[PDB]
Amino acid sequence: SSRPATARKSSGLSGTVRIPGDKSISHRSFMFGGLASGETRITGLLEGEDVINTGKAMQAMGARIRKEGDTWIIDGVGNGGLLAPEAPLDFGNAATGCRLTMGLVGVYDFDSTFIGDASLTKRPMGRVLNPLREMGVQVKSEDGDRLPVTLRGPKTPTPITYRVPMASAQVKSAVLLAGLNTPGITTVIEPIMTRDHTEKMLQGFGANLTVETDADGVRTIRLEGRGKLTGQVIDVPGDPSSTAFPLVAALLVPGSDVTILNVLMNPTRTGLILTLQEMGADIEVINPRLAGGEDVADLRVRSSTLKGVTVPEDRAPSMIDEYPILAVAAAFAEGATVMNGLEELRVKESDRLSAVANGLKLNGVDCDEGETSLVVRGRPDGKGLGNASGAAVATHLDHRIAMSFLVMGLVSENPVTVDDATMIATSFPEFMDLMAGLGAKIELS
Numbered sequence: 542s543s544r545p546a547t548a549r550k551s552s553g554l555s556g557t558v559r560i561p562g563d564k565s566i567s568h569r570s571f572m573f574g575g576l577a578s579g580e581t582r583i584t585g586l587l588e589g590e591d592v593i594n595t596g597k598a599m600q601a602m603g604a605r606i607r608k609e610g611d612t613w614i615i616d617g618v619g620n621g622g623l624l625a626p627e628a629p630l631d632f633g634n635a636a637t638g639c640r641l642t643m644g645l646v647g648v649y650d651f652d653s654t655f656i657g658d659a660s661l662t663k664r665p666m667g668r669v670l671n672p673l674r675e676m677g678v679q680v681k682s683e684d685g686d687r688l689p690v691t692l693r694g695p696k697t698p699t700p701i702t703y704r705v706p707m708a709s710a711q712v713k714s715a716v717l718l719a720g721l722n723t724p725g726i727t728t729v730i731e732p733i734m735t736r737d738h739t740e741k742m743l744q745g746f747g748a749n750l751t752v753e754t755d756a757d758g759v760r761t762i763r764l765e766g767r768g769k770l771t772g773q774v775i776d777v778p779g780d781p782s783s784t785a786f787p788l789v790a791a792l793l794v795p796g797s798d799v800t801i802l803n804v805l806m807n808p809t810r811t812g813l814i815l816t817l818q819e820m821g822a823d824i825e826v827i828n829p830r831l832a833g834g835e836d837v838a839d840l841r842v843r844s845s846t847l848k849g850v851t852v853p854e855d856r857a858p859s860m861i862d863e864y865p866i867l868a869v870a871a872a873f874a875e876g877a878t879v880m881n882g883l884e885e886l887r888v889k890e891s892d893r894l895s896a897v898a899n900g901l902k903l904n905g906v907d908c909d910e911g912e913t914s915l916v917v918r919g920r921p922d923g924k925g926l927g928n929a930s931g932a933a934v935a936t937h938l939d940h941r942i943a944m945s946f947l948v949m950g951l952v953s954e955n956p957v958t959v960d961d962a963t964m965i966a967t968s969f970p971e972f973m974d975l976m977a978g979l980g981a982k983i984e985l986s
């Protein structure tokens with residue numbers, strides 16, 4: 542079952558908080574630490590449900606994982622050393638874990654089965670299963686290439702050169718991870734850059750992986766297969782997608798001044814910040830530095846008056862998971878915010894385009910949902926927004942829909958209710974406590 546929650550108008554958010562670790566990097570830390578030779582030590586790991594599921598999948602294949610103090614320590618099996626799992630690998634709500642693991646173990650000569658929850662089971666897997674079929678993996682999937690899926694790798698996989706058709710870092714990642722156990726050179730060509738945690742981290746683990754960018758922006762990523770991977774010390778930066786929630790809340794709630802510490806600032810993750818700055822947001826980037834091999838900074842966010850802007854389709858990959866919270870900010874901006882190139886939103890935990898549009902309408906917002914776009918016209922004073930009758934936003938098992946609308950309720954004249962807050966812990970278990978500490982009033986049923 543589910544647990545609804547209602548957000549109420551706040552008098553001002555204020556404080557300094559450390560945001561939880563980056564989910565993308567956390568997933569990969571468990572995966573690469575579990576695969577590599579020797580020991581990997583991780584500090585700052587996100588302990589949300591999605592990451593825990595990836596950890597259990599790696600344990601199922603032979604890695605030993607334990608938490609000593611505040612450090613997760615992993616004893617890896619070495620490249621080529623994964624063991625056949627006894628039972629299905631349950632990824633719950635996590636597409637990142639599921640899709641990357643399909644590439645990782647699908648190329649091994651044993652059977653592996655992938656299952657997940659009601660939301661993950663409806664998402665498309667063909668985007669990863671097709672290149673695996675080219676590599677020689679035998680695939681048994683449900684119609685439409687959906688879970689459950691059982692893979693059986695060939696004795697010797699075939700390396701491929703794959704041009705990713707949509708701006709998916711998960712597809713690029715799955716093909717590169719498959720390349721780790723494939724003899725020869727695996728090449729991934731990305732016409733538009735997507736988050737590059739896989740490339741940066743594999744290089745950090747010693748992989749002979751190179752990235753070449755043409756002047757036209759196309760990336761050619763080459764990986765030599767069956768090479769040694771060496772355990773590493775990892776310091777996980779703060780999640781920029783989780784940061785988006787208290788950050789947008791601070792921009793919208795009058796009388797706010799919130800500082801978020803140690804936030805990942807890799808440009809493939811900062812499209813929302815750039816967009817909000819263009820809308821007039823007061824976001825100060827403090828002490829930009831290098832930590833754990835990544836760019837991080839502290840962000841001081843203050844109440845701002847926002848104006849609608851046009852968000853180009855090519856910025857989408859750099860902020861794809863932040864469209865829900867951006868749409869909420871647009872609900873309080875002067876004028877229209879226009880966002881196109883949103884086809885990928887329809888295949889996430891929920892069809893995010895439909896869920897955001899329906900949630901906004903339920904809460905009095907004037908918006909137009911297109912097949913691949915969203916136009917939102919705001920009401921800066923928040924008058925008439927929210928839902929006085931207490932009607933609940935349908936979250937469709939999507940944690941980001943739940944968090945985005947709860948942020949809306951801190952600003953709207955009328956409270957905003959979401960039908961379920963139980964999935965928030967998949968990526969941000971600290972959400973309720975963190976927001977409450979800043980002054981937000983959110984009542985869990």
Ligand SMILES: C[C@](O[C@@H]1CC(C(=O)O)=C[C@@H](OP(=O)(O)O)[C@H]1O)(C(=O)O)P(=O)(O)O
Pocket residue numbers: 564565566635636637708709710711712714736782861862885889890941968
């Ligand atoms: C959607 C989501 O976040 C995704 C995680 C992810 C990664 O490699 O770590 C890449 C993107 O997916 P894609 O563009 O390759 O399809 C994100 O949207 C996910 O984990 O599935 P999140 O919203 O649940 O964080």
